[PDB]
Design a protein around this ligand. Sequence first.
Ligand code: 0B3
Length: 360
Amino acid sequence: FVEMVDNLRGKSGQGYYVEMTVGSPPQTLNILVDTGSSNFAVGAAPHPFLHRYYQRQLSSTYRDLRKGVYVPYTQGKWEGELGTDLVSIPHGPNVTVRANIAAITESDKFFINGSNWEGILGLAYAEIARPDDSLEPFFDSLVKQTHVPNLFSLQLCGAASVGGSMIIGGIDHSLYTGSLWYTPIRREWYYEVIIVRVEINGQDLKMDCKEYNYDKSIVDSGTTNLRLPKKVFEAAVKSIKAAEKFPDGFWLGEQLVCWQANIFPVISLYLMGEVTNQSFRITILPQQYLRPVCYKFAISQSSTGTVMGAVIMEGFYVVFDRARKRIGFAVSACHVHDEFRTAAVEGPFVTLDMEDCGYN
Ligand SMILES: CN1C(=O)C[C@@](C)(CCc2ccccc2)N=C1N
């Protein structure tokens, strides 16, 4: 799939985007790749931060759905008008599908000033689509209208500019080393998974595993940080500082920390495996959670559950195997390492009562 290799670009902190075309004749747009939502939504009016925007009036294949959507978040919000149109991915499979598109007509704290993308491709499931689950997500339309196999994979490489690969409909073995290990998608809404154990520096947190997934744990290409429930976060900071100059605000991501150009440990998440009582672990390095910015501590707290963002994903090739309701992780070919260590994916381990780790 050398076709699709290196089809992702971006800037540090501003997400990964893929080029797409919309409409007839095709309009080129850069589109944020987001496994944490399910709407395909594109700027459709000259907001001054945008390099480009969807112009429905130019498209002979546009169809108005005559319904608007209001989409607020914790930070920003956007509003738009729903329609369908023909959509392609030039450095993707060789097909053209009719898909839902939200023409964004008004937004606040959503688009990034200085960024080079103009829309968002929500790759998760219909259940969290707005305004509701009848609004078929793009990838569902893609698979339903073509012979493209029902899976995609992401290699996020993070270098100011970043690159990566989104292999649509398959897997490229050049993008990873060692073996793929799979964890069950617990429910098709977000890409939800279950953390059964957490280690730092090899020693374990010894918390009720339910604390790792309150009230969910997801895989999200649209988040930068590893985001942990507060309880989990504090223990992780304790263990990590243990492995100095520790201003409290820094851990709270309230301030920045500057060193000059090992006292930080590896971090292992054990994920629910495919077989009863079997799990595996993925291990990241400080090079994943210390983000060159004066590095920012890229582990943060949340109230939405655990989120495995780019801090987790830049260490791994991640396979979103929707056909088999599962997500695979393998050591990424592009991840940043030493001559001493690497990120790791290892198994099998024996972990009992894994179902109990899921909040409900
Ligand atoms: C974490 N997350 C959101 O808060 C909602 C969205 C839709 C925001 C995507 C976004 C927007 C601007 C910059 C980065 C990511 N997707 C997410 N995955």
